[PDB]
Amino acid sequence: RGYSFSLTTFSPSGKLVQIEYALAAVAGGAPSVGIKAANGVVLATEKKQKSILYDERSVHKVEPITKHIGLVYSGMGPDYRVLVHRARKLAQQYYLVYQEPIPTAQLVQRVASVMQEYTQSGGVRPFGVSLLICGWNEGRPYLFQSDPSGAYFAWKATAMGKNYVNGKTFLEKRYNEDLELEDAIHTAILTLKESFEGQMTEDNIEVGICNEAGFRRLTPTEVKDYLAAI
Amino acid sequence: AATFFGEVVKAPCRAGTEDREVRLQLARKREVRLLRRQTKTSLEVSLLEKYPCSKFIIAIGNNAVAFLSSFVMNSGVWEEVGCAKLWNEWCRAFCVFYHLKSNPSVFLCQCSCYVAEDQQYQWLEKVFGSCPRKNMQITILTCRHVTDYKTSESTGSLPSPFLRALKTQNFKDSACCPLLEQPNIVHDLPAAVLSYCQVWKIPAILYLCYTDVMKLDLITVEAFKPILSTRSLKGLVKNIPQSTEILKKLMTTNEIQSNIYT
Amino acid sequence: RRYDSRTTIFSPEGRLYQVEYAMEAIGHAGTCLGILANDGVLLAAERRNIHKLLDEVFFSEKIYKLNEDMACSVAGITSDANVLTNELRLIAQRYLLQYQEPIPCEQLVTALCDIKQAYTQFGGKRPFGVSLLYIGWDKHYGFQLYQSDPSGNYGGWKATCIGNNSAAAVSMLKQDYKEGEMTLKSALALAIKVLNKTMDVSKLSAEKVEIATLTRENGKTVIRVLKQKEVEQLIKKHEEEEAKAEREK
Amino acid sequence: MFVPCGESAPDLAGFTLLMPAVSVGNVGQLAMDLIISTLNMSKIGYFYTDCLVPMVGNNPYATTEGNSTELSINAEVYSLPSRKLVALQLRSIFIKYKSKPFCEKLLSWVKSSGCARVIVLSSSHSYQRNDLQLRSTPFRYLLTPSMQKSVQNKIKSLNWEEMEKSRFCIRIPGGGITKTLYDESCSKEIQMAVLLKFVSEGDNIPDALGLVEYLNEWLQILKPLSSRWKIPSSWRLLFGSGLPPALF
Amino acid sequence: MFRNQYDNDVTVWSPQGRIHQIEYAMEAVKQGSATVGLKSKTHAVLVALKRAQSELAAHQKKILHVDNHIGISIAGLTADARLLCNFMRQECLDSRFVFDRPLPVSRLVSLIGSKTQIPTQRYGRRPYGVGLLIAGYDDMGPHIFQTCPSANYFDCRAMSIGARSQSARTYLERHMSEFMECNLNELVKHGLRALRETLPAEQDLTTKNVSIGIVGKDLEFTIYDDDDVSPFLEGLEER
Amino acid sequence: SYDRAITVFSPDGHLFQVEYAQEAVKKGSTAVGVRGRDIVVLGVEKKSVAKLQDERTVRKICALDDNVCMAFAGLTADARIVINRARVECQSHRLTVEDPVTVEYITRYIASLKQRYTQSNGRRPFGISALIVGFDFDGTPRLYQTDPSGTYHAWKANAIGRGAKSVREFLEKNYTDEAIETDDLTIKLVIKALLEVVQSGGKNIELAVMRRDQSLKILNPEEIEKYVAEIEKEKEE
Amino acid sequence: SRGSSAGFDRHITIFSPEGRLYQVEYAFKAINQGGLTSVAVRGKDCAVIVTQKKVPDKLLDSSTVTHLFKITENIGCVMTGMTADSRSQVQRARYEAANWKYKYGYEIPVDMLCKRIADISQVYTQNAEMRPLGCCMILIGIDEEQGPQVYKCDPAGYYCGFKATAAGVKQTESTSFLEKKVKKKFDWTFEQTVETAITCLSTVLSIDFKPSEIEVGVVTVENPKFRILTEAEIDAHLVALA
Amino acid sequence: MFLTRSEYDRGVNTFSPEGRLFQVEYAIEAIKLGSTAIGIQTSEGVCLAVEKRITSPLMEPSSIEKIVEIDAHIGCAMSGLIADAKTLIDKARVETQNHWFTYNETMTVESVTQAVSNLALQFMSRPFGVALLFGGVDEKGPQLFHMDPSGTFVQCDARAIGSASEGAQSSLQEVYHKSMTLKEAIKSSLIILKQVMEEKLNATNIELATVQPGQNFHMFTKEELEEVIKDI
Amino acid sequence: PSHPLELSEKNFQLNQDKMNFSTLRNIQGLFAPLKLQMEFKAVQQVQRLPFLSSSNLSLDVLRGNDETIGFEDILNDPSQSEVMGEPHLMVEYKLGLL
């Protein structure tokens, strides 16, 4: 208990507890999934503003970084906004220096490097977010995840947020490698529906896709059509 | 108590809350020993068990020691019977016991050192022992700073120095000063001696001087004068002007001071 | 304990408990192994990111190339390991720019260890919980192998191990290592045997082990990562040799 | 040991024992003062040891001009024979390496004299609380397995909450000698109950005023709630002396 | 017992609306020797008492020189007194150099108070632990001022600070109605008589433990000590 | 208490953290230095010689300049910084003044560097102690010691690390004007001093020798064995 | 400086075992210290903000008590919470709007101003020196290509756009009432929006209002400038409503 | 009426209820663990005497570590933590050299004294643990100064510092007079140090220097000391 | 010096801060620059050791440079510096000990 308050203190067994608590904060957010298909990547999430008093075109959880990169989060929105701005600035700097769009892996590495700094100094607090990043480079798709501690992994399909162990279990047996984009969208929506705790509508979920044409956020009409289809 | 920016700190607590050789050596270094200087050997029995006693006068602090030296020990023959050796962070200072030659049942103590909390009960065991005698009267003298007093007014408006007293149940006499007020308490060695006397049914009285100057000062020493008329020291004071001259001579000699204050 | 709240406090017996805890943090990571031979150096590691839904990108997950002559392997916290490897690459390039000649391995290790030591002396900072192994070749001493600690200490070895079951691996290597008469094939066989006896798996598989080799050919240093076919062949050879040895009793 | 004030020790033929623990905030000691002042108990003896720092003072419970000049020490015993109750008060702090011998001596005296049960009032640190404890009642209790079944049934009826266990051992940070007393009572088959409260240092009179009501919910030594407690005369200057002039 | 948590820093209020570190700092003034200051219609006098000590091992200076018309006396810590004296000297020198003219005593005291207030509010500092008596002469008549560790200053007709200065203050208040209509000698005699009240009955003022500072119409600030105080002490009564 | 901060004084005038920094020194390997008539000798105990270890990278004797060498006891990582700083400062002073640096000058620089780190609560002291030995420009041998607190002294023979008490007790009675007559006698005296606390024969001894107008030389294991055999033969005789 | 305080709910940069920020959560309870409630409703071509006016002392000058502020010539505001914190945040918003105009050459939009304020507020929750402000901001304005706007930001650094929102003590009841009304209908004229807001406040507080107990501020497509209604106009609306 | 715990001595910027700085007091107590030093100012010079306290016979006594030369006319003495005085000595030397180079005359002792004091009053975050005895001669004449860890200087005529300072001060009080001679001052210093020191007096256990208006700063050698010791 | 633009380019943030502070003090009062300076110092007091490259996220958010790219961001990358000193010397220099 004496080592549970300080960020720069190692436990006698060699553990950092505040990073575990930040991960616990991440694990209590809204669910989100991501599936990498044979020709695209799909990101889905559940909205927070589930009311009629919400202006639709005010705040979004699925955002673009470049024409071929987009991301979704699970955790604290205020921490997500500043990271999004920094990622956009880094991508623009890379394009200015090299006259070429940034690859997804380089952007993920730079963002993780930014995130790592807030876990080694006193008087600050770690970020309470985890990011899912999708991209298209050299004619093949990518999908990455980033922890509050500054570590990143590459996935074929993953889930995070509230009730994510059962979501990963569902994805394990419902996933096929040689899978198209439409069936990937169906699988993502079904995984989100597994633990929705309510009745889904085209006005409380967000979907974004990435393919050869670039990243794009789906309109509510298409989401309603997909929901009716399944 | 933060050493760097953003350090997590804990509040202080006002209620407290192989390596055996290290513990044993430390305990042996802070042990109270009673010695006989004329023979450089310890005593196998308690001091008050060896000799009969009828009166006992204890002075703690430099001012009370100076007062007793000037006004009591100036006349008569006093023989040293032992001394105590102590070590702590605040004491390297002596603790010497005498008794009157004409009346061998009258004792006197001159304690000018500091006894820590873990050495007070050892002191009591070495001096008194475990065979109390109820036909014995004890008088204790000490001094305290005026800022320790608690009052509804400001401590700067109190006319100091002044005297206060505390008595046990068997002390049938009356003090020469008002008794100490309620919310005020006394701790350390005089409290230990008074507690011993109260528990074991021995008459005793404690005299407290609250002064604004805690070093060797003439006004603080002379604040003890009213006790000279009490039954405890009535037959032990002979020449007052000689005592005043000795007090002036002693006062015109003091240790060198530092440059902190001016 | 009242002497283990920060790195800038000494215990009455003269110990640094925060540094000790940081060194203790290394025991949770995977196993990494290194062997020095007469004509090459070896590096073998254990894969921990094993999962059906994980993707395979990059060339390796625990072995990095620092310059044309050196490579390293890390065990500990990945976020700190990334910073350390980037700094190592920067230092090597700086020396190359300064002197128009490649940096020696001991110089690179000392340069990184100074940085690692600087974080255990100034307050308000958390020491790196990473241990590293270095292999390389230089014109002064030839093939070399080093190790590093979170406290900033390093040393030169002929065979060593960091991570899980490090003590058992070290004991086995000490018992069954020959000095002065080792080749790459024998080193690979010894590494396979040690990894099999170290990893707590009944049957070893080629999808949870990665091996890298450094050697010199025609005045050039060659660093390559072994293929799954070669790893499977080595494992099969070790298994059949063990069966033969058991049967001939 | 118990030194009687008079000549013969009183007969404490299994009455009760109410004692505090020197813990954070002195909440147990303040509650003991409240109980002793309210019930108008009378002193019967002394508990003389060598484990507490010595201190003296006049009577802390003074009502007239004839009983205000009675000397007091750091450990005293009060009794009320009509209700069969015994009270102990500690007014000082412990010396290093002197708590366990004190607990052993006290429990030996409790066994030797002969008492039905022992009740301890204590407190614990408030900042060492997890999320579930932050939204719950700040009062906890603890019972020795030797306790009578009727007490357990009554406490179950009262709808109280028990102190949580940690990996399993009992830990009471900032509780002083509470854990030692509980362990020794468990190992020596003595009926003991512990009541505590999460507090912080500062002005802690309301904490004691809450703890006394918590105890009264069970013992019911006073008319049930639906002031009641007498503040002792020594609670006069709890912040110090007066304000110096030429400042405000 | 409930003050332990609110009396360790100067930037913490107590539940009673008090700051105890300032009062503790004010308590440090009473650890120095007594000083007496008084003024007449044409003169200002400072009188100080030197500590009972062997002159071989220490020569302490209780009266200092700031300018040609300003002098101070100190009681408390010595480092703070040195810092304040340096600040006042630098301010007076800058004022003269920029606009050659005597610096007003009121403005000097205002600057001192403004400087002293800051550490009582900032964190990481402590209040100054020295009290000053300031005697000056400008184109407004003589002035006597008193300064406090609480960053307060007062305008006085006669004041005494230090250890056991209550008797001196009582004497000054009793004899305060006959100070303007006096010459230098009688004013110095009154100051010495007031200072003598802070001693036991038997001792007397000798030419070994007294210092005198005088400023007036055309007399610049001068300090008298050792055998220079004999003319002032040779006309006093017994007691 | 009074030992949880670097800059807190004990009620009797003690800085306990700086004293704790010396307990780390008292746990290192023994190092012995002896100043001869025209030679200076250093010696360090070798502890825990691993089988698969390279001895080139774990040496505890270093050369600061052409005429100054040093040995240390304490934390191993802390000594490297001080050694590098002293090495740079020697060349800086050689640029400043053409003449070669002085042993006392470099000792004072090291002492000031060590003392700089005992002034603030934001940094911790260096837990090492050193034996600086060398030759001056005129040709007078010198020997010095440095403490973690920043104090230095001049000696004729000294020892640091564990066993320093027994080694110094031996040296106080075995150091005369006859035992330092020749280089061989000085080396034998150093080996005898080391052998008091070192078991397992003379296989755990590292020796360094410096002469006038020459560079630091490290003795070979064969030479060490020859000296040990000579000492044993003389003792048996 | 002082240093952090041990505990899971006593410092801003310390997580709890469930990953919560109790110091941030405690700043949401300072909004209820004042005891007032605010309501903002967006119409077809107008936006209205209505708050509560309470002057307990008869020696106060009622002209100096207000909670409606003017940030820009076309942007209005209403503050709920601590008075000094609200005033300081209003000053900061004015400074940020001036900076935006100087840097970009045209007036700042409502959503951009709210985003900038939220970005500033987010920094206070990650550093161990500053503390969050105990107040919430609601802004209204007219967009030249989108229409009326209603925005709100929180002490945690979170902002969003609404059709009708509320803040203060009776926020939940106001939200339920507004949800029912918006579900029934959403296309309102200028007179229906102010009546809806006043009826919401009256129904939730169970009180009959006098023209000296409420404050009203409006913007309109025809007149984009922020305007504060007078007692005569408020009384006329109340009479029409009754 | 309870007994509780309160601490006021763990910070350098904390006042006790009676107005005391316990950290500074402890720093002053820390200089009681050093060797004894004696300085006497006469009408024709100042004599500074210290003891070396050689712990072990292997230590080289030829080292000079207790008396330091500041300039051609200023001496010094030390007691306590010797490592703490290096910055003060360096600043004094730099200041006196700069002033001499600029003005083309030697500064008085008081100027360098104030310059040194201006550096010690900066609590490095802790007080110094050393005590100094500045001595020298100027146009005004020989004069002696004393400093404490409090960071302030005073002028004196006969001062003794170190562990055994009380007895030395008592002897200096019962001896010494205003109009005396440098030779007998040196002698009396030798006798007083002889009684103060626990062991015997030799030519290497102590070291002393002197400054007089005639010559520059001079430190006694072994040959000069032997005659004085034999003169006893 | 060598070029008219060298000194101007070296001191640009300082001059911009001075201009903003002067305008803010003239328009609003003394409190706003005080608060801005205290926030700047507080957010700037936490960062990596000087021999490693930092990011300055909170400081950039406070200053407003989180949506702007200048020539200091694309020319002469400070992260990939070609020269660097010793760690202890750099840390000591930052503290003013040198």
PDB file of all heavy atoms in Angstrom, chain D residues 175-189:
ATOM      1  N   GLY D 175      -3.418   1.795  14.351  1.00  0.00           N
ATOM      2  CA  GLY D 175      -4.239   1.341  15.455  1.00  0.00           C
ATOM      3  C   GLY D 175      -3.496   1.175  16.763  1.00  0.00           C
ATOM      4  O   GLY D 175      -4.116   0.959  17.808  1.00  0.00           O
ATOM      5  N   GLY D 176      -2.170   1.271  16.725  1.00  0.00           N
ATOM      6  CA  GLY D 176      -1.374   1.151  17.930  1.00  0.00           C
ATOM      7  C   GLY D 176      -1.203  -0.273  18.421  1.00  0.00           C
ATOM      8  O   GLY D 176      -0.571  -1.096  17.754  1.00  0.00           O
ATOM      9  N   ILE D 177      -1.761  -0.573  19.595  1.00  0.00           N
ATOM     10  CA  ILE D 177      -1.638  -1.890  20.208  1.00  0.00           C
ATOM     11  C   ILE D 177      -2.881  -2.745  19.979  1.00  0.00           C
ATOM     12  O   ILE D 177      -3.026  -3.801  20.605  1.00  0.00           O
ATOM     13  CB  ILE D 177      -1.334  -1.770  21.709  1.00  0.00           C
ATOM     14  CG1 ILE D 177      -2.316  -0.803  22.371  1.00  0.00           C
ATOM     15  CG2 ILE D 177       0.095  -1.306  21.927  1.00  0.00           C
ATOM     16  CD1 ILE D 177      -2.297  -0.846  23.881  1.00  0.00           C
ATOM     17  N   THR D 178      -3.785  -2.310  19.099  1.00  0.00           N
ATOM     18  CA  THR D 178      -5.037  -3.031  18.888  1.00  0.00           C
ATOM     19  C   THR D 178      -4.785  -4.424  18.324  1.00  0.00           C
ATOM     20  O   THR D 178      -5.375  -5.410  18.786  1.00  0.00           O
ATOM     21  CB  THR D 178      -5.948  -2.232  17.957  1.00  0.00           C
ATOM     22  OG1 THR D 178      -6.232  -0.956  18.544  1.00  0.00           O
ATOM     23  CG2 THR D 178      -7.252  -2.970  17.726  1.00  0.00           C
ATOM     24  N   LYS D 179      -3.912  -4.526  17.320  1.00  0.00           N
ATOM     25  CA  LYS D 179      -3.637  -5.825  16.715  1.00  0.00           C
ATOM     26  C   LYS D 179      -2.964  -6.766  17.704  1.00  0.00           C
ATOM     27  O   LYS D 179      -3.293  -7.957  17.758  1.00  0.00           O
ATOM     28  CB  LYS D 179      -2.775  -5.656  15.466  1.00  0.00           C
ATOM     29  CG  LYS D 179      -2.386  -6.972  14.818  1.00  0.00           C
ATOM     30  CD  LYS D 179      -1.443  -6.768  13.650  1.00  0.00           C
ATOM     31  CE  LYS D 179      -0.997  -8.102  13.078  1.00  0.00           C
ATOM     32  NZ  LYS D 179      -2.145  -9.030  12.889  1.00  0.00           N
ATOM     33  N   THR D 180      -2.014  -6.253  18.489  1.00  0.00           N
ATOM     34  CA  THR D 180      -1.355  -7.088  19.490  1.00  0.00           C
ATOM     35  C   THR D 180      -2.348  -7.582  20.531  1.00  0.00           C
ATOM     36  O   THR D 180      -2.331  -8.762  20.907  1.00  0.00           O
ATOM     37  CB  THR D 180      -0.222  -6.312  20.160  1.00  0.00           C
ATOM     38  OG1 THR D 180       0.647  -5.770  19.158  1.00  0.00           O
ATOM     39  CG2 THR D 180       0.576  -7.221  21.077  1.00  0.00           C
ATOM     40  N   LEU D 181      -3.230  -6.696  21.003  1.00  0.00           N
ATOM     41  CA  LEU D 181      -4.237  -7.104  21.976  1.00  0.00           C
ATOM     42  C   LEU D 181      -5.161  -8.166  21.396  1.00  0.00           C
ATOM     43  O   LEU D 181      -5.471  -9.160  22.063  1.00  0.00           O
ATOM     44  CB  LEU D 181      -5.041  -5.890  22.439  1.00  0.00           C
ATOM     45  CG  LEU D 181      -4.447  -5.053  23.572  1.00  0.00           C
ATOM     46  CD1 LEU D 181      -5.030  -3.651  23.556  1.00  0.00           C
ATOM     47  CD2 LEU D 181      -4.690  -5.718  24.915  1.00  0.00           C
ATOM     48  N   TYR D 182      -5.603  -7.978  20.150  1.00  0.00           N
ATOM     49  CA  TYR D 182      -6.490  -8.951  19.524  1.00  0.00           C
ATOM     50  C   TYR D 182      -5.808 -10.304  19.370  1.00  0.00           C
ATOM     51  O   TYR D 182      -6.404 -11.346  19.672  1.00  0.00           O
ATOM     52  CB  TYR D 182      -6.961  -8.432  18.166  1.00  0.00           C
ATOM     53  CG  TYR D 182      -7.948  -9.339  17.470  1.00  0.00           C
ATOM     54  CD1 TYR D 182      -9.280  -9.371  17.854  1.00  0.00           C
ATOM     55  CD2 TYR D 182      -7.548 -10.163  16.428  1.00  0.00           C
ATOM     56  CE1 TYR D 182     -10.185 -10.198  17.222  1.00  0.00           C
ATOM     57  CE2 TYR D 182      -8.447 -10.994  15.790  1.00  0.00           C
ATOM     58  CZ  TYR D 182      -9.763 -11.007  16.191  1.00  0.00           C
ATOM     59  OH  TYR D 182     -10.663 -11.833  15.558  1.00  0.00           O
ATOM     60  N   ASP D 183      -4.554 -10.310  18.910  1.00  0.00           N
ATOM     61  CA  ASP D 183      -3.843 -11.569  18.716  1.00  0.00           C
ATOM     62  C   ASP D 183      -3.623 -12.292  20.038  1.00  0.00           C
ATOM     63  O   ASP D 183      -3.823 -13.510  20.128  1.00  0.00           O
ATOM     64  CB  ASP D 183      -2.509 -11.315  18.016  1.00  0.00           C
ATOM     65  CG  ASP D 183      -2.679 -10.940  16.559  1.00  0.00           C
ATOM     66  OD1 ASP D 183      -3.834 -10.798  16.110  1.00  0.00           O
ATOM     67  OD2 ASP D 183      -1.655 -10.787  15.861  1.00  0.00           O
ATOM     68  N   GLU D 184      -3.213 -11.562  21.078  1.00  0.00           N
ATOM     69  CA  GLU D 184      -2.981 -12.203  22.369  1.00  0.00           C
ATOM     70  C   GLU D 184      -4.283 -12.714  22.978  1.00  0.00           C
ATOM     71  O   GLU D 184      -4.304 -13.785  23.593  1.00  0.00           O
ATOM     72  CB  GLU D 184      -2.276 -11.237  23.319  1.00  0.00           C
ATOM     73  CG  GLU D 184      -0.878 -10.838  22.878  1.00  0.00           C
ATOM     74  CD  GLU D 184       0.022 -12.035  22.644  1.00  0.00           C
ATOM     75  OE1 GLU D 184       0.354 -12.732  23.625  1.00  0.00           O
ATOM     76  OE2 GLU D 184       0.399 -12.277  21.479  1.00  0.00           O
ATOM     77  N   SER D 185      -5.379 -11.968  22.818  1.00  0.00           N
ATOM     78  CA  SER D 185      -6.666 -12.440  23.317  1.00  0.00           C
ATOM     79  C   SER D 185      -7.116 -13.693  22.579  1.00  0.00           C
ATOM     80  O   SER D 185      -7.674 -14.614  23.188  1.00  0.00           O
ATOM     81  CB  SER D 185      -7.716 -11.338  23.192  1.00  0.00           C
ATOM     82  OG  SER D 185      -7.627 -10.425  24.271  1.00  0.00           O
ATOM     83  N   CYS D 186      -6.896 -13.742  21.263  1.00  0.00           N
ATOM     84  CA  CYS D 186      -7.229 -14.944  20.505  1.00  0.00           C
ATOM     85  C   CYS D 186      -6.388 -16.131  20.957  1.00  0.00           C
ATOM     86  O   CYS D 186      -6.894 -17.252  21.073  1.00  0.00           O
ATOM     87  CB  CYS D 186      -7.040 -14.691  19.009  1.00  0.00           C
ATOM     88  SG  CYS D 186      -8.457 -13.923  18.196  1.00  0.00           S
ATOM     89  N   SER D 187      -5.100 -15.904  21.216  1.00  0.00           N
ATOM     90  CA  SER D 187      -4.216 -16.986  21.626  1.00  0.00           C
ATOM     91  C   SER D 187      -4.405 -17.396  23.081  1.00  0.00           C
ATOM     92  O   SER D 187      -3.943 -18.475  23.467  1.00  0.00           O
ATOM     93  CB  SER D 187      -2.756 -16.590  21.395  1.00  0.00           C
ATOM     94  OG  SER D 187      -2.531 -16.241  20.042  1.00  0.00           O
ATOM     95  N   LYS D 188      -5.065 -16.571  23.896  1.00  0.00           N
ATOM     96  CA  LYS D 188      -5.244 -16.871  25.312  1.00  0.00           C
ATOM     97  C   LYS D 188      -6.705 -17.054  25.707  1.00  0.00           C
ATOM     98  O   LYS D 188      -7.005 -17.105  26.906  1.00  0.00           O
ATOM     99  CB  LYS D 188      -4.609 -15.772  26.171  1.00  0.00           C
ATOM    100  CG  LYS D 188      -3.108 -15.925  26.352  1.00  0.00           C
ATOM    101  CD  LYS D 188      -2.443 -14.589  26.642  1.00  0.00           C
ATOM    102  CE  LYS D 188      -3.138 -13.860  27.778  1.00  0.00           C
ATOM    103  NZ  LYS D 188      -2.823 -14.460  29.102  1.00  0.00           N
ATOM    104  N   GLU D 189      -7.613 -17.158  24.739  1.00  0.00           N
ATOM    105  CA  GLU D 189      -9.027 -17.455  24.984  1.00  0.00           C
ATOM    106  C   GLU D 189      -9.659 -16.443  25.941  1.00  0.00           C
ATOM    107  O   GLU D 189     -10.106 -16.775  27.041  1.00  0.00           O
ATOM    108  CB  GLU D 189      -9.197 -18.883  25.506  1.00  0.00           C
ATOM    109  CG  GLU D 189      -8.851 -19.958  24.494  1.00  0.00           C
ATOM    110  CD  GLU D 189      -9.013 -21.356  25.056  1.00  0.00           C
ATOM    111  OE1 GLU D 189      -9.275 -21.482  26.270  1.00  0.00           O
ATOM    112  OE2 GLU D 189      -8.882 -22.329  24.284  1.00  0.00           O
TER     113      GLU D 189
END
